[PDB]
Amino acid sequence: PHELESQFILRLPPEYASTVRRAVQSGHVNLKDRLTIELHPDGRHGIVRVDRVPLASKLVDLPCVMESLKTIDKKTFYKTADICQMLVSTEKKFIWNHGITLPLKNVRKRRFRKTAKKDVEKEVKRLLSTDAEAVSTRWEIIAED
């Protein structure tokens, strides 16, 4: 079978980004030893090791949706993957408010309609399970107390 490739964006500190960029544009397999990525079983935490120097990483959710588009003639572009995650290196914390491009900054707060937005279902399921487990259930919409 075929499994859709999973592309994400890696953001590095600027000096380490310059060293990684120079090693990528060089093209040797020396970069392979220099750059490693360890993703922790949290799923939202990691180390990126540049030249064997550990950096602390967080996999965050991006507010917009990006799409990688490949081409052979630079006139027709074929969509290859959807990017929604970024492993910035240096829950609410795992959500990124800004977008990658310069015009998209504070997009989630300002350029996003709140009608579309709004975990709730999981809490409802837990409440239903507790009610099923219980013998007698008493409910009242309340006031200030």
Binding site: L127, S136, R138, W139, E140
Partner: protein, 56 residues
Amino acid sequence: TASVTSLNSSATGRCLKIYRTFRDEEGKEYVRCETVRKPAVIDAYVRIRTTKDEEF
């Protein structure tokens, strides 16, 4: 955060409290009263309960 209108705990300004009777190991009959301070989720839960009553 960009200034936005802050909604009250629902139109009624009413929270949801649920009592639950259970039997512990050996012999016991403890009752746990739990209050939902979340306005939306609480409204959805009340709607689900009324819907379930009609499912009879």
